Structures are given as C-alpha cells and as structure tokens.
Amino acid sequence: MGEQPIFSTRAHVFQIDPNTKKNWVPTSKHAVTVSYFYDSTRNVYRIISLDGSKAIINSTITPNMTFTKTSQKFGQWADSRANTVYGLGFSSEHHLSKFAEKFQEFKEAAR
Numbered sequence: 079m080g081e082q083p084i085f086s087t088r089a090h091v092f093q094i095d096p097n098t099k100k101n102w103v104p105t106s107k108h109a110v111t112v113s114y115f116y117d118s119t120r121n122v123y124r125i126i127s128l129d130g131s132k133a134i135i136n137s138t139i140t141p142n143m144t145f146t147k148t149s150q151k152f153g154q155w156a157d158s159r160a161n162t163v164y165g166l167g168f169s170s171e172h173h174l175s176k177f178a179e180k181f182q183e184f185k186e187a188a189r
Contacts (some may be wrong), residue, residue: 079118085180086113088172091127091134092165094154102165105134112166114180123184125164135164141189145181153178 079112088109095101112127112135117159120138127135137143147153150171168174 082116082118084114084116084123086111087168087177088112089166089168089173089177091129092167093094096162099163105129109167109169110134110175114184116184122188136160136174137164137180139184139188141185143185143188145178147174147178150174155181 089112091105091111091112092102093105095103106129108129110127110129112125115124115126116122117124123139125137125139126133127133132140137155143155143157145153145155146166151169151174152165152167153174154163154165157179166174166177168177
C-alpha cells in the first residue's frame with residue numbers, strides 16, 4: 079500500500095509559541111489519535127494526527143529528529159517542514175514511554 083497504518087495512540091497536542099519557543103500552545107481541545115504511518119510512495123514514516131478532519135500533525139521522521147521526554151507524561155520534538163516544535167501530553171508515563179520507543183525505531187529506518 080501507499081500509506082501503511084502502523085501504530086496509534088491518544089494524546090493532547092501542543093505546539094511551542096513561534097515567538098520565543100518557551101510557552102506551550104494547545105493545538106487540540108481534546109485528546110486525539112496520534113499515529114505512525116509508513117508512506118511507501120516516499121519511503122518515510124510520518125506522525126499523523128487529525129482533530130476532526132483537520133490535520134494538526136503531519137510530521138515526517140528524519141534521521142536526526144529527536145523526541146524528548148519533558149515530564150513523565152509529556153514529550154516534544156522539532157519539525158522543519160512546519161517550522162515548529164510539537165508537544166504531546168499522554169494520560170500515563172507508559173503511553174509516553176511507548177510513543178518515544180516507536181519514535182526511535184522509525185528514526186533508524188529513516189537513516
């Protein structure tokens with residue numbers, strides 16, 4: 079297939095404020111589904127999330143992109159295509175933990 083579903087989880091989505099990159103701005107009002115998809119048409123993994131029919135995340139994973147845990151339930155990563163920093167807040171450390179693990183896997187496939 080051109081777009082292959084791989085993994086899906088839920089979280090509240092945020093982006094850092096453009097101006098000083100320090101204040102968190104909510105992007106979704108609800109927790110939404112955040113997923114990893116493999117795009118074979120472009121040969122890359124993508125992090126995709128829609129709030130309703132509005133894509134709020136469509137981040138291609140690149141070899142040096144890095145996911146950082148900020149608390150036991152929240153983590154972030156920088157994205158140059160959209161020129162921002164995404165933050166994800168999970169209901170539990172186990173979910174943040176698992177998301178970060180998958181991130182590392184597809185980062186390597188990218189390299």
